[PDB]
């Protein structure tokens, strides 16, 4: 017998998902299936167990019958969902050491309490409040600690941007950095080529130690389904768009202090697009953008709290122009990918920074349209998509479908994971 | 269905065994049965899950057949060993916040992953170490923390010697002790009438707070059984004893900054006390308590590593005078009560200082004689069991016996720990 | 020569000011003359340094003038601000262990820095942030801490309210309840007869480990100078207050999930009063109170970021039946008290619920009207000093007034600290 | 006018000198003359202010004489001494987080109160206790950040040996790493060609964020002096050498885990050598060297304690053979340096490992015999210096003498870290 194990060490996606790493998850588990039978063909059994901070039922996010609903799917299979000890009232989801350091020790707990039970564990760990797991369990786990392969992912402490990480992040960050040059079984995920380089150059990480994790969408899913334009206008009139105009539409996290995705741009930009009204869609209500479309006088649809189902209907309107994603430096977006998945038939094309894994989602060119990250190359690459022929439109809408099946789907790309790990398990 | 499980977290007792705690959980388990038949009558069946630190092969006080013997004992009636993960080495079994942190998130864990499988849970925690969890529990475990006791024991941070406690050890014994005041589910085990006290006035505990887990001995056990007096001999014969003398012997943890066993005091007194030979047996070879002896110029037997089976030949032989415990505060010595229980047919009577438990552990005159902590005292204290005929040295030596059967009998005891925690388990 | 210098150790007052301990640096500096005089008279040539973490310059509250008018005022006399480490950004002010620990740490490194330059120093450190000074300095700074007097304040976690204080709240306020029962030089400055009981009964603090530190009004200051019935209606008049109405007003810190300020209370009780028009100005607008006021359907006037030199002439109108404060447990609120100053010719009268200080600034009700805190209650409060006769109404009112010259002038009470302190200073 | 402040934060020195650290202090001070006469013509009037924890006045190595001596050197010339504050009794000299973040906080705090003084700062900082200071200066310090220049240096953390650092010792060196990324005024001081190296593979630190701070000798100094053949009989005849042999000699920190000196390989070695006596001087007694001496069988001198007076006598004999220098990374040991200038008119000549910087103090072979680390090629290292005519003896034992002169002369080495920092303090 041969039983693999599988712990996902995750801060959200089963009591509470804003986004990102909560999608992850989400689509994690609708593959599992997949993974259990492809990786039964290597001679594994797998068993998934997930592991998640406590959280208390207050908390942005919580939604208590999708913790039943993802605990139930991993007890039918053989595996289980296990509640961590963090250190906190459970209302945050983040922190600090305390916090890093509780998280980090019980992540550590749960994957030696099932080394024990199994006969290899390839850990993925995510986020600096799991950095610590990897040391914690190849310095204390002796002869549990050989069967584990550890591959922490999403997010290491950079400088590519003008904010400064806590003290607390470059500390975690700083322990994996050292456990993968002293460690076979220590290795980094790299969601994109740009965090691939930028890692390897940043943490001395030595180049066998970081192991593929691509960020990717499930292409074959029913969000991601081609709308007909009717199921367009209905959803699009709720949201009180401009009789004429066409549109330049950008989603996600509000703009903060840490991370800038850049709204306040294309407020400027359209400044100088005659006919073009920004819609921007964040997360919150964001007060500063009217006050800044109200300084600069453009004609701008802000929107809060919208379901992807009425963004994917923007998305693929015949009056829209272009998704535009604009972050500081994104390591791993992927509301880029889903953008060009979702206007595959009709929509918008993509416009995209130079910055961080934007361009090579549009493969620096060929499936969508890059620009610098300042006012006036952004009206500039506005002006460039309008200045395309009908053909050379879906000629490169279809260049980007196509990339999204040879890059981005996740099914391919969670695989890669999966195997590059179990290659590693051998002896 | 109300199955009931006892969480013990302890940092020794399974993979390492110094003494103290090691001891406590050696006697824990020759008792389980008993306590599984009591509580039964209760209807409680009890499960034992037992939690300790990893540690490095390579420990101090390492045995890995006691590891498995332990690990099998604890299977055979359905509980189990869960090793820990601290943040270390694993090869000091103490340290300050890093490990007493993480020690006590993981601690916390297991007793939340425990109390998900079971209907209530009683978690006997023990150290500074694990000081942490019981508000860790309470404030984040939501309704498995309802179903949870706790009973923290073991040692509280305290100003009665004059060792100034390490910040640490002053952070964790903060926490328990808020922690009382803000949950019914937050107790504190003391192991003393000394100690129940002190922990009162010192921490601003509530008198119900409050739950007994007075430190004891087995009775019954094999160690304890009257030894002949020449089994007696032969195990005296290797220690080197002068011909002529009688003894007054002392044992455990050498002297050192924070603790003070009262070693060097006896061999002060021992100038003005002229048939009396000190009889030092340390866990380690003290070079300084010898030449102390040499400039005090005292015949003294000074002995290492000495195994209770020839210590307790010593406190049996009629050329015992008596044992002595001198510490500057023992909250909790034990090596007094096995010293009265040994010598029931025969052996030393016991002198014992005015400081710990002491005093209670020989009913303040009536089962031993007790001395002030100083040279002049002592030497008197031997003095007046010399000036003891041989009636009233058995009526007092029979009255010891019979306080260890009364107040001090681990099987009483640990039921009186059980049955406490119980009857607050109600609703 | 016996120079004594006075370390204040403060986490607001120079570079920012946001408020409450804020306004006790403001007070503290201009009295400083008096004190240095008084003392004088005792024999002390006292210097003042004060302590307060850097901050950087986009901070809420900083004023890089008020920065150097402080910082000039104390080098004036001999002084010195010192701009202190704590782990931060600096854009905070508060934060958990690191900010807590450097903070501490560098604050006990300034209180040794400056007990070498004189001959003896009496330390008053607040909050929570600086409780780890007390132990920091008396364990390892020798001789040079026995010239310190440590009285730290501002604050001890408490389960007077709903709210569970941090881990690390719990951890530091637990070093220095430890540090009171281990040193002579180390005491709790209380700041009311509330906080007086309730810290000496939680954490165990010796009776003599108690100093008085009692909250208080700078009563001869310029902003409680009494206003002329003109001067009232050009502030009142761009509050867009209704024309016909009598007032009920409150202001402070927005309420929040630790801090409750009573305000949905007063909304909900005029519910149940025909004339009264609730006045509640929060430090930033709140949707809730609207929302709130809407759904309960009474007419409030409800401002932000109001200057207390439009709120003092709110209070002094005959149109203001009563200044209401609400708060679940407030331990040292000081606008009860200048709202009693501040109606000494004209004004409201003070409604206190019967819950933190409060009734102690009221006399129990021979100064003001006591309520418990619920809306039926506060219906009747109000009530109840509308049936009081113009008589019964300003005696009440001279009595108040009364009040803050006995207890709670400013002027009197640090030096009410300062002396208590000088005193333990002897040999 | 411009004055320049250096700020040395050592972790030892002035109230304890145990050794490594405390002797680059004990050349520091007597150097500084010198540095300041050389940087006054670079136009700099340049300030001492050395930074070092309180210590307790009984931990090892404590003299407060040289603690009175060191205060007021640095007083006579304008400078100061300041005791720091760390987390600890005082009497350790090393721990883990707690002290390193008191100690790096408060040392920090240091380097702004004297930046605020002076127009430029160059802070040299040692150890992982002070490896954060270079990250809380620049986060926080605002505009007093930028005069300061930081040269962290003596250690980071590595994989070069069997021993896995302490966790604490990774976060802290994880830190300057981070930040030599981060900022043109974070460097890291090389003590040697080897650590050079390893560091800038081991951290990815910019080839630029290298400073030279290479280990050195005083040359010049009276310990340094040529004995004559007396005075080298006298101090040899204390202690009990076998009147028949050569010999071969080592002397440092006894072995340990984390710390490998080479003692066990030479008695190992000598059991294969007729007529050589190993002489090893370690600062403890080494029982364990002893009973392998004993089971090895060969003849071995072991001393403890021995003063450099007794030693540079032993390594000036015409009866010694070598000085031998076997650990396993040594990363700046001085000890070889010192062996080669105290044997320039006649001695011993030097064995080095291949190691650590041992192979470059002796120059790759030209000014020294380099071995491996195993017993039989040490063995055979003594015979080479053996086979070494009277001709080869004295040419070799000339070329280390010249290199110790052009690559290890103290005076030298730091003023070319002083210069090197200097250079990067324009504009």
């Known amino acids: ?37 492809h990786l039964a063909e290597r001679g594994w059994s797998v068993e998934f167990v997930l592991g998640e901070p406590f ?108 904010h400064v990480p806590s003290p607390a992040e470059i500390a975690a960050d ?67 768009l401009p009789a004429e105009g066409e549109f330049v539409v950008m989603w996600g996290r509000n703009s903060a202090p840490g991370l800038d995705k850049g709204y306040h741009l294309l407020l400027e930009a359209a400044r100088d697009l005659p006919g073009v009204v920004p819609v921007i869609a964040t997360r919150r209500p964001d007060p500063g953008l009217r006050r800044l479309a109200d300084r600069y006088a453009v004609p701008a649809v802000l929107l809060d709290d919208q379901p992807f189902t009425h963004l994917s209907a923007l998305l693929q309107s015949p009056r829209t122009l272009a998704a535009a994603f604009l972050g500081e430096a994104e390591p791993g977006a992927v509301s880029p990918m889903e953008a060009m998945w979702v206007a595959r038939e009709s929509g918008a094309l993509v416009i995209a920074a130079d910055t961080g894994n934007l361009p090579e ?20 690459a506005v002006r460039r998509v309008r200045k395309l022929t009908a053909d050379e439109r879906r000629r490169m809408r279809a260049a980007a479908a196509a990339r999204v099946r040879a890059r981005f789907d996740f099914a391919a790309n969670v695989r890669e994971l999966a195997d590059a790990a179990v290659d590693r398990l051998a002896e």
């Open 1 to 37: 017998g041969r039983a693999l194990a599988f712990v996902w060490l995750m801060v959200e996606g089963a009591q509470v998902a804003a986004g990102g790493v909560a999608g992850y998850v989400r689509n994690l588990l609708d593959e599992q299936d997949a993974l259990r039978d």
């Open 55 to 162: 959280y208390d039922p207050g908390a942005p996010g919580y939604d208590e019958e999708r913790w039943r609903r993802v605990r139930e799917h991993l007890a039918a299979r053989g595996g289980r969902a296990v509640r961590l000890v963090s250190d906190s009232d459970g209302l945050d989801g983040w922190g600090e050491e305390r916090f890093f350091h509780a998280l980090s020790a019980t992540g550590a707990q749960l994957v030696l309490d099932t080394a024990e039970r199994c006969d290899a564990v390839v850990a993925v760990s995510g986020t600096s409040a799991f950095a610590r797991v990897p040391g914690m369990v190849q310095r204390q786990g002796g002869e549990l600690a050989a069967k584990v392969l550890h591959v922490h992912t999403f997010g290491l402490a950079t400088h590519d941007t003008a």
């Open 174 to 240: 700083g322990d994996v950095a050292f456990w993968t040059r002293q460690s076979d079984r220590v290795s980094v995920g790299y969601i994109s080529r740009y965090t691939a380089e930028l890692y390897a150059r940043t943490y001395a990480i030595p180049a066998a130690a970081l192991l593929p994790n691509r960020s990717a969408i499930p292409r074959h899913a029913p969000r991601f389904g081609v709308l007909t334009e009717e199921r367009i206008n209905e959803r699009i009139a709720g949201l009180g």
């Open 361 to 380: 989602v549009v493969d620096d060119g060929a499936a969508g349209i890059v620009t610098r990250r300042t006012a006036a190359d952004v009206a500039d």
